[PDB]
PDB file of C-alpha atoms in Angstrom:
ATOM      1  CA  UNK Y   6     -78.502 -37.458 236.070  1.00 34.77           C
ATOM      2  CA  UNK Y   7     -81.707 -36.683 237.938  1.00 36.10           C
ATOM      3  CA  UNK Y   8     -84.571 -35.641 235.685  1.00 37.00           C
ATOM      4  CA  UNK Y   9     -86.407 -32.310 235.704  1.00 36.00           C
ATOM      5  CA  UNK Y  10     -90.046 -32.712 234.611  1.00 38.04           C
ATOM      6  CA  UNK Y  11     -92.337 -29.851 233.516  1.00 37.35           C
ATOM      7  CA  UNK Y  12     -95.752 -30.005 235.185  1.00 38.49           C
ATOM      8  CA  UNK Y  13     -99.195 -28.469 234.676  1.00 41.55           C
ATOM      9  CA  UNK Y  14     -99.564 -25.362 236.794  1.00 38.81           C
ATOM     10  CA  UNK Y  15     -96.154 -23.932 235.839  1.00 36.40           C
ATOM     11  CA  UNK Y  16     -94.280 -26.177 238.257  1.00 35.92           C
ATOM     12  CA  UNK Y  17     -91.318 -28.540 237.945  1.00 33.26           C
ATOM     13  CA  UNK Y  18     -90.438 -31.711 239.802  1.00 36.20           C
ATOM     14  CA  UNK Y  19     -87.030 -33.379 240.016  1.00 35.21           C
ATOM     15  CA  UNK Y  20     -87.079 -37.193 239.977  1.00 37.32           C
ATOM     16  CA  UNK Y  21     -84.144 -39.316 241.083  1.00 38.82           C
ATOM     17  CA  UNK Y  22     -82.446 -41.101 238.208  1.00 41.61           C
ATOM     18  CA  UNK Y  23     -82.693 -44.510 239.862  1.00 38.05           C
ATOM     19  CA  UNK Y  24     -84.912 -46.253 242.378  1.00 38.23           C
ATOM     20  CA  UNK Y  25     -84.048 -47.361 245.895  1.00 41.08           C
ATOM     21  CA  UNK Y  26     -84.144 -50.927 247.243  1.00 42.20           C
ATOM     22  CA  UNK Y  27     -87.925 -50.604 247.687  1.00 40.71           C
ATOM     23  CA  UNK Y  28     -88.245 -49.687 244.001  1.00 40.52           C
ATOM     24  CA  UNK Y  29     -89.132 -46.105 244.849  1.00 38.54           C
ATOM     25  CA  UNK Y  30     -88.008 -42.770 243.434  1.00 36.87           C
ATOM     26  CA  UNK Y  31     -87.231 -39.551 245.301  1.00 36.81           C
ATOM     27  CA  UNK Y  32     -89.135 -36.409 244.283  1.00 37.57           C
ATOM     28  CA  UNK Y  33     -88.297 -32.792 245.103  1.00 35.44           C
ATOM     29  CA  UNK Y  34     -89.935 -29.560 243.977  1.00 34.61           C
ATOM     30  CA  UNK Y  35     -89.722 -25.906 244.920  1.00 34.28           C
ATOM     31  CA  UNK Y  36     -93.063 -24.083 244.807  1.00 32.95           C
ATOM     32  CA  UNK Y  37     -92.691 -20.332 245.318  1.00 37.25           C
ATOM     33  CA  UNK Y  38     -90.033 -20.521 248.074  1.00 37.21           C
ATOM     34  CA  UNK Y  39     -91.245 -23.811 249.598  1.00 37.09           C
ATOM     35  CA  UNK Y  40     -89.278 -27.050 249.375  1.00 34.82           C
ATOM     36  CA  UNK Y  41     -91.521 -30.090 248.874  1.00 36.73           C
ATOM     37  CA  UNK Y  42     -90.374 -33.705 248.861  1.00 33.05           C
ATOM     38  CA  UNK Y  43     -91.807 -37.170 248.480  1.00 33.66           C
ATOM     39  CA  UNK Y  44     -91.383 -40.739 247.319  1.00 32.28           C
ATOM     40  CA  UNK Y  45     -93.074 -42.419 244.361  1.00 30.83           C
ATOM     41  CA  UNK Y  46     -93.311 -45.897 242.889  1.00 29.08           C
ATOM     42  CA  UNK Y  47     -93.227 -44.405 239.372  1.00 29.64           C
ATOM     43  CA  UNK Y  48     -90.181 -43.011 237.580  1.00 36.77           C
ATOM     44  CA  UNK Y  49     -91.790 -40.206 235.568  1.00 39.42           C
ATOM     45  CA  UNK Y  50     -92.407 -37.406 238.102  1.00 37.91           C
ATOM     46  CA  UNK Y  51     -95.868 -38.491 239.210  1.00 40.04           C
ATOM     47  CA  UNK Y  52     -96.778 -38.975 242.861  1.00 39.27           C
ATOM     48  CA  UNK Y  53     -97.123 -36.964 246.046  1.00 39.05           C
ATOM     49  CA  UNK Y  54     -94.807 -34.328 247.540  1.00 36.92           C
ATOM     50  CA  UNK Y  55     -95.284 -32.599 250.875  1.00 37.79           C
ATOM     51  CA  UNK Y  56     -93.934 -29.614 252.724  1.00 39.83           C
ATOM     52  CA  UNK Y  57     -94.993 -26.788 254.986  1.00 41.66           C
ATOM     53  CA  UNK Y  58     -95.539 -23.086 254.738  1.00 42.54           C
ATOM     54  CA  UNK Y  59     -93.554 -20.716 256.944  1.00 39.45           C
ATOM     55  CA  UNK Y  60     -96.693 -20.450 259.120  1.00 39.99           C
ATOM     56  CA  UNK Y  61     -96.788 -24.279 259.591  1.00 38.29           C
ATOM     57  CA  UNK Y  62     -99.725 -24.935 257.199  1.00 42.93           C
ATOM     58  CA  UNK Y  63     -99.241 -28.293 255.483  1.00 43.32           C
ATOM     59  CA  UNK Y  64     -98.755 -28.313 251.707  1.00 41.99           C
ATOM     60  CA  UNK Y  65     -99.291 -31.262 249.364  1.00 43.42           C
ATOM     61  CA  UNK Y  66     -98.583 -31.462 245.636  1.00 45.68           C
ATOM     62  CA  UNK Y  67    -100.214 -34.445 243.894  1.00 44.79           C
ATOM     63  CA  UNK Y  68     -99.166 -35.158 240.305  1.00 45.56           C
ATOM     64  CA  UNK Y  69    -101.352 -37.615 238.377  1.00 48.25           C
ATOM     65  CA  UNK Y  70     -99.828 -40.846 237.067  1.00 45.22           C
ATOM     66  CA  UNK Y  71     -99.624 -39.570 233.481  1.00 47.17           C
ATOM     67  CA  UNK Y  72     -98.434 -36.030 234.436  1.00 49.23           C
ATOM     68  CA  UNK Y  73    -101.649 -34.586 233.004  1.00 49.32           C
ATOM     69  CA  UNK Y  74    -103.024 -32.955 236.170  1.00 46.22           C
ATOM     70  CA  UNK Y  75    -101.618 -31.403 239.326  1.00 43.22           C
ATOM     71  CA  UNK Y  76    -103.302 -30.562 242.618  1.00 43.50           C
ATOM     72  CA  UNK Y  77    -101.704 -28.126 245.070  1.00 40.32           C
ATOM     73  CA  UNK Y  78    -103.347 -28.176 248.494  1.00 43.07           C
ATOM     74  CA  UNK Y  79    -102.820 -26.237 251.698  1.00 44.09           C
ATOM     75  CA  UNK Y  80    -104.149 -27.548 255.006  1.00 43.08           C
ATOM     76  CA  UNK Y  81    -104.309 -26.510 258.628  1.00 43.23           C
ATOM     77  CA  UNK Y  82    -101.048 -27.120 260.492  1.00 44.14           C
ATOM     78  CA  UNK Y  83    -102.210 -30.581 261.655  1.00 43.33           C
ATOM     79  CA  UNK Y  84    -103.123 -31.550 258.065  1.00 43.24           C
ATOM     80  CA  UNK Y  85    -106.762 -32.192 258.967  1.00 46.11           C
ATOM     81  CA  UNK Y  86    -108.832 -29.539 257.161  1.00 48.07           C
ATOM     82  CA  UNK Y  87    -108.339 -28.028 253.714  1.00 49.71           C
ATOM     83  CA  UNK Y  88    -107.538 -24.353 253.448  1.00 46.58           C
ATOM     84  CA  UNK Y  89    -107.031 -24.078 249.686  1.00 47.25           C
ATOM     85  CA  UNK Y  90    -106.872 -26.292 246.618  1.00 45.99           C
ATOM     86  CA  UNK Y  91    -105.636 -25.537 243.099  1.00 48.92           C
ATOM     87  CA  UNK Y  92    -106.236 -28.183 240.407  1.00 48.22           C
ATOM     88  CA  UNK Y  93    -104.684 -27.677 236.974  1.00 44.47           C
ATOM     89  CA  UNK Y  94    -106.243 -30.033 234.433  1.00 45.60           C
ATOM     90  CA  UNK Y  95    -104.722 -31.360 231.212  1.00 48.12           C
ATOM     91  CA  UNK Y  96    -106.073 -28.483 229.095  1.00 47.78           C
ATOM     92  CA  UNK Y  97    -104.165 -26.207 231.536  1.00 44.76           C
ATOM     93  CA  UNK Y  98    -107.382 -24.735 232.885  1.00 44.53           C
ATOM     94  CA  UNK Y  99    -107.471 -24.402 236.642  1.00 43.35           C
ATOM     95  CA  UNK Y 100    -109.843 -24.343 239.591  1.00 44.03           C
ATOM     96  CA  UNK Y 101    -108.699 -22.533 242.740  1.00 45.32           C
ATOM     97  CA  UNK Y 102    -110.762 -22.945 245.887  1.00 47.35           C
ATOM     98  CA  UNK Y 103    -110.729 -21.593 249.419  1.00 45.53           C
ATOM     99  CA  UNK Y 104    -112.468 -23.419 252.270  1.00 44.63           C
ATOM    100  CA  UNK Y 105    -113.935 -22.338 255.607  1.00 45.73           C
ATOM    101  CA  UNK Y 106    -113.200 -23.875 259.006  1.00 45.75           C
ATOM    102  CA  UNK Y 107    -115.572 -26.797 258.296  1.00 45.10           C
ATOM    103  CA  UNK Y 108    -113.827 -27.538 254.997  1.00 44.39           C
ATOM    104  CA  UNK Y 109    -116.712 -26.079 252.974  1.00 42.40           C
ATOM    105  CA  UNK Y 110    -115.839 -24.269 249.770  1.00 41.33           C
ATOM    106  CA  UNK Y 111    -116.215 -20.492 250.147  1.00 39.76           C
ATOM    107  CA  UNK Y 112    -114.579 -19.310 246.902  1.00 42.03           C
ATOM    108  CA  UNK Y 113    -114.006 -20.978 243.542  1.00 43.16           C
ATOM    109  CA  UNK Y 114    -112.087 -19.321 240.710  1.00 39.79           C
ATOM    110  CA  UNK Y 115    -112.169 -21.178 237.389  1.00 40.13           C
ATOM    111  CA  UNK Y 116    -109.560 -20.002 234.874  1.00 43.36           C
ATOM    112  CA  UNK Y 117    -110.180 -21.430 231.414  1.00 40.78           C
ATOM    113  CA  UNK Y 118    -107.338 -22.330 229.060  1.00 37.64           C
ATOM    114  CA  UNK Y 119    -107.922 -19.020 227.251  1.00 38.95           C
ATOM    115  CA  UNK Y 120    -107.582 -16.953 230.425  1.00 38.65           C
ATOM    116  CA  UNK Y 121    -111.241 -16.053 230.852  1.00 37.58           C
ATOM    117  CA  UNK Y 122    -112.587 -16.789 234.318  1.00 37.96           C
ATOM    118  CA  UNK Y 123    -115.644 -17.650 236.335  1.00 39.20           C
ATOM    119  CA  UNK Y 124    -115.351 -16.230 239.851  1.00 37.83           C
ATOM    120  CA  UNK Y 125    -117.653 -17.563 242.557  1.00 38.49           C
ATOM    121  CA  UNK Y 126    -117.327 -15.772 245.872  1.00 40.61           C
ATOM    122  CA  UNK Y 127    -119.155 -15.664 249.173  1.00 42.16           C
ATOM    123  CA  UNK Y 128    -120.229 -19.260 248.597  1.00 43.90           C
ATOM    124  CA  UNK Y 129    -122.588 -20.543 251.279  1.00 44.68           C
ATOM    125  CA  UNK Y 130    -123.339 -24.075 252.435  1.00 44.86           C
ATOM    126  CA  UNK Y 131    -126.154 -24.426 249.870  1.00 45.19           C
ATOM    127  CA  UNK Y 132    -123.795 -23.668 246.980  1.00 41.97           C
ATOM    128  CA  UNK Y 133    -125.207 -20.181 246.439  1.00 45.40           C
ATOM    129  CA  UNK Y 134    -122.981 -17.145 246.068  1.00 43.98           C
ATOM    130  CA  UNK Y 135    -121.933 -14.217 243.948  1.00 46.54           C
ATOM    131  CA  UNK Y 136    -120.799 -14.825 240.378  1.00 49.08           C
ATOM    132  CA  UNK Y 137    -118.697 -12.963 237.835  1.00 49.31           C
ATOM    133  CA  UNK Y 138    -117.482 -13.977 234.401  1.00 47.29           C
ATOM    134  CA  UNK Y 139    -114.234 -12.271 233.410  1.00 47.39           C
ATOM    135  CA  UNK Y 140    -113.926 -11.938 229.641  1.00 46.63           C
ATOM    136  CA  UNK Y 141    -111.371 -10.208 227.442  1.00 47.52           C
ATOM    137  CA  UNK Y 142    -112.319  -6.548 227.846  1.00 49.65           C
ATOM    138  CA  UNK Y 143    -115.293  -6.729 230.227  1.00 46.67           C
ATOM    139  CA  UNK Y 144    -116.957  -8.584 233.080  1.00 47.26           C
ATOM    140  CA  UNK Y 145    -120.473  -9.953 233.519  1.00 48.16           C
ATOM    141  CA  UNK Y 146    -121.915 -10.039 237.036  1.00 51.45           C
ATOM    142  CA  UNK Y 147    -124.672 -11.921 238.781  1.00 50.44           C
ATOM    143  CA  UNK Y 148    -125.410 -14.789 241.130  1.00 53.23           C
ATOM    144  CA  UNK Y 149    -124.888 -18.494 241.708  1.00 57.54           C
ATOM    145  CA  UNK Y 150    -127.342 -21.085 242.987  1.00 55.60           C
ATOM    146  CA  UNK Y 151    -126.975 -24.850 242.919  1.00 56.91           C
ATOM    147  CA  UNK Y 152    -129.210 -24.745 239.799  1.00 54.46           C
ATOM    148  CA  UNK Y 153    -127.448 -22.127 237.664  1.00 53.88           C
ATOM    149  CA  UNK Y 154    -125.249 -19.075 237.361  1.00 52.49           C
ATOM    150  CA  UNK Y 155    -127.179 -16.030 236.104  1.00 53.33           C
ATOM    151  CA  UNK Y 156    -125.247 -13.031 234.769  1.00 54.72           C
ATOM    152  CA  UNK Y 157    -127.206  -9.875 234.004  1.00 56.80           C
ATOM    153  CA  UNK Y 158    -126.802  -6.749 231.853  1.00 57.10           C
ATOM    154  CA  UNK Y 159    -129.448  -4.016 231.928  1.00 58.93           C
ATOM    155  CA  UNK Y 160    -130.047  -1.268 229.379  1.00 62.65           C
ATOM    156  CA  UNK Y 161    -133.148   0.899 229.437  1.00 65.45           C
ATOM    157  CA  UNK Y 162    -136.162  -1.347 229.926  1.00 67.81           C
ATOM    158  CA  UNK Y 163    -134.216  -4.396 228.656  1.00 68.64           C
ATOM    159  CA  UNK Y 164    -132.504  -7.100 230.719  1.00 70.37           C
ATOM    160  CA  UNK Y 165    -130.137  -9.628 229.153  1.00 71.57           C
ATOM    161  CA  UNK Y 166    -129.471 -12.747 231.238  1.00 69.72           C
ATOM    162  CA  UNK Y 167    -126.730 -15.270 230.473  1.00 69.51           C
ATOM    163  CA  UNK Y 168    -127.408 -18.530 232.295  1.00 68.31           C
ATOM    164  CA  UNK Y 169    -124.855 -21.274 232.886  1.00 69.85           C
ATOM    165  CA  UNK Y 170    -126.603 -24.358 234.201  1.00 72.13           C
ATOM    166  CA  UNK Y 171    -125.095 -26.606 236.853  1.00 69.42           C
ATOM    167  CA  UNK Y 172    -124.221 -28.913 233.936  1.00 66.87           C
ATOM    168  CA  UNK Y 173    -122.350 -26.127 232.104  1.00 67.81           C
ATOM    169  CA  UNK Y 174    -124.996 -25.510 229.425  1.00 67.84           C
ATOM    170  CA  UNK Y 175    -125.315 -21.863 228.341  1.00 70.34           C
ATOM    171  CA  UNK Y 176    -128.612 -20.229 227.492  1.00 74.36           C
ATOM    172  CA  UNK Y 177    -129.397 -16.546 227.088  1.00 74.73           C
ATOM    173  CA  UNK Y 178    -132.661 -14.693 227.527  1.00 75.78           C
ATOM    174  CA  UNK Y 179    -133.845 -11.150 226.979  1.00 78.26           C
ATOM    175  CA  UNK Y 180    -136.842  -9.404 228.519  1.00 79.02           C
ATOM    176  CA  UNK Y 181    -138.181  -5.906 227.818  1.00 78.36           C
ATOM    177  CA  UNK Y 182    -140.591  -4.551 230.430  1.00 78.62           C
ATOM    178  CA  UNK Y 183    -142.021  -2.009 227.940  1.00 77.93           C
ATOM    179  CA  UNK Y 184    -144.551  -3.785 225.722  1.00 77.59           C
ATOM    180  CA  UNK Y 185    -144.749  -0.804 223.349  1.00 76.25           C
ATOM    181  CA  UNK Y 186    -141.271  -1.493 221.936  1.00 77.29           C
ATOM    182  CA  UNK Y 187    -142.458  -4.837 220.480  1.00 79.46           C
ATOM    183  CA  UNK Y 188    -138.963  -6.194 221.290  1.00 77.74           C
ATOM    184  CA  UNK Y 189    -138.348  -9.862 222.162  1.00 76.07           C
ATOM    185  CA  UNK Y 190    -135.614 -12.440 221.629  1.00 77.41           C
ATOM    186  CA  UNK Y 191    -135.212 -16.145 220.956  1.00 75.25           C
ATOM    187  CA  UNK Y 192    -132.318 -18.429 221.878  1.00 77.02           C
ATOM    188  CA  UNK Y 193    -130.943 -21.041 219.462  1.00 77.07           C
ATOM    189  CA  UNK Y 194    -128.952 -23.587 221.487  1.00 78.82           C
ATOM    190  CA  UNK Y 195    -127.722 -25.149 218.240  1.00 83.33           C
ATOM    191  CA  UNK Y 196    -125.709 -22.077 217.229  1.00 86.82           C
ATOM    192  CA  UNK Y 197    -125.408 -20.400 220.648  1.00 88.78           C
ATOM    193  CA  UNK Y 198    -127.212 -17.388 219.161  1.00 90.04           C
ATOM    194  CA  UNK Y 199    -129.743 -14.963 220.626  1.00 92.01           C
ATOM    195  CA  UNK Y 200    -131.816 -13.340 217.879  1.00 95.12           C
ATOM    196  CA  UNK Y 201    -133.473 -10.068 218.868  1.00 97.72           C
ATOM    197  CA  UNK Y 202    -136.742  -9.181 217.132  1.00 96.44           C
ATOM    198  CA  UNK Y 203    -138.548  -5.831 217.036  1.00 95.22           C
ATOM    199  CA  UNK Y 204    -142.045  -5.688 215.521  1.00 94.90           C
ATOM    200  CA  UNK Y 205    -141.706  -9.251 214.188  1.00 94.77           C
ATOM    201  CA  UNK Y 206    -138.533  -8.402 212.242  1.00 96.49           C
ATOM    202  CA  UNK Y 207    -135.147  -9.741 213.259  1.00 97.24           C
ATOM    203  CA  UNK Y 208    -132.770  -6.928 214.191  1.00 99.62           C
ATOM    204  CA  UNK Y 209    -129.596  -8.517 215.625  1.00100.31           C
ATOM    205  CA  UNK Y 210    -127.886 -11.855 216.254  1.00102.68           C
ATOM    206  CA  UNK Y 211    -125.767 -12.012 219.417  1.00104.13           C
ATOM    207  CA  UNK Y 212    -123.494 -15.062 219.201  1.00105.39           C
ATOM    208  CA  UNK Y 213    -121.970 -16.461 222.384  1.00104.11           C
ATOM    209  CA  UNK Y 214    -118.992 -18.206 220.855  1.00104.09           C
ATOM    210  CA  UNK Y 215    -117.003 -21.222 221.970  1.00106.74           C
ATOM    211  CA  UNK Y 216    -114.034 -18.829 222.282  1.00103.68           C
ATOM    212  CA  UNK Y 217    -115.811 -17.101 225.196  1.00106.31           C
ATOM    213  CA  UNK Y 218    -116.533 -13.999 223.160  1.00104.14           C
ATOM    214  CA  UNK Y 219    -119.747 -12.309 222.084  1.00103.93           C
ATOM    215  CA  UNK Y 220    -120.339 -11.022 218.569  1.00107.88           C
ATOM    216  CA  UNK Y 221    -123.162  -8.868 217.249  1.00108.44           C
ATOM    217  CA  UNK Y 222    -124.457  -8.711 213.682  1.00108.29           C
ATOM    218  CA  UNK Y 223    -127.375  -6.679 212.346  1.00108.57           C
ATOM    219  CA  UNK Y 224    -130.084  -7.756 209.942  1.00105.56           C
ATOM    220  CA  UNK Y 225    -131.148  -5.807 206.883  1.00103.16           C
ATOM    221  CA  UNK Y 226    -134.267  -3.672 207.299  1.00104.71           C
ATOM    222  CA  UNK Y 227    -136.246  -6.578 205.783  1.00104.36           C
ATOM    223  CA  UNK Y 228    -135.715  -8.429 209.061  1.00103.96           C
ATOM    224  CA  UNK Y 229    -134.789 -11.630 207.226  1.00106.09           C
ATOM    225  CA  UNK Y 230    -131.195 -11.455 205.926  1.00105.48           C
ATOM    226  CA  UNK Y 231    -128.040 -10.720 207.873  1.00102.95           C
ATOM    227  CA  UNK Y 232    -126.017  -7.781 206.646  1.00100.36           C
ATOM    228  CA  UNK Y 233    -122.355  -6.896 206.857  1.00101.57           C
ATOM    229  CA  UNK Y 234    -120.244  -9.021 209.168  1.00101.67           C
ATOM    230  CA  UNK Y 235    -120.347  -9.875 212.871  1.00102.74           C
ATOM    231  CA  UNK Y 236    -118.446  -7.559 215.219  1.00103.13           C
ATOM    232  CA  UNK Y 237    -116.758  -8.873 218.342  1.00102.07           C
ATOM    233  CA  UNK Y 238    -117.759  -7.142 221.581  1.00 99.42           C
ATOM    234  CA  UNK Y 239    -114.753  -5.584 223.340  1.00 97.39           C
ATOM    235  CA  UNK Y 240    -116.381  -3.805 226.310  1.00100.07           C
ATOM    236  CA  UNK Y 241    -119.560  -3.904 228.359  1.00 98.23           C
ATOM    237  CA  UNK Y 242    -120.749  -0.646 226.783  1.00 99.56           C
ATOM    238  CA  UNK Y 243    -121.055  -2.466 223.455  1.00101.29           C
ATOM    239  CA  UNK Y 244    -123.338  -5.120 224.957  1.00102.49           C
ATOM    240  CA  UNK Y 245    -125.539  -2.308 226.223  1.00100.59           C
ATOM    241  CA  UNK Y 246    -125.519  -0.742 222.756  1.00 99.10           C
ATOM    242  CA  UNK Y 247    -126.745  -4.038 221.298  1.00 99.08           C
ATOM    243  CA  UNK Y 248    -129.746  -3.910 223.661  1.00 99.15           C
ATOM    244  CA  UNK Y 249    -130.888  -0.435 222.574  1.00101.41           C
TER     245      UNK Y 249
END
């Protein structure tokens, strides 16, 4: 019998059970309502399938040799210029892009394996644009340049900035415009922790975890020892509270 194969990106491909005289296998897939078909020199479901949208846009599904990654592309009706591209990688994260008439990326939505997202919109030819990080319970908003993404939360005279460098490195900074508060903060890249200090005493640790969450934990009034246990932020209002 022909073989149904589960693919990254919640798709399936059907591979012929045997090869033709050229050694090649037939592939068919249905994506939404669209029938795609192709030929492959592998027997496992990998290779290229093609079809069209009802509006004549060309569609291509490319499945990597080891089934680990899929790419779903839409093109102009002559197949020349990209219109959209969705890549699902082997961790099941995805990048979904839209392109302008010159084939330049104008939107990029990154969905991590845990469902959190980075949304880059209004992207211009210099790689600048608007940026949003979509977390569980809240969103952080800011801007993109080719150097970094900067997401900003303001509370009173305080501004918290989460930076994601072009390399993916996260750093966080805090600035208070009112010198009389004696409030500052230091970033520890080793533990992904911003420590806020008021009057030379530590007040709070904000941890930016590898699970794409933020936790807050207070220090004792001595300013030296942590107290209690860290609390996970569930809404933007709680980030603002941590900046008070």
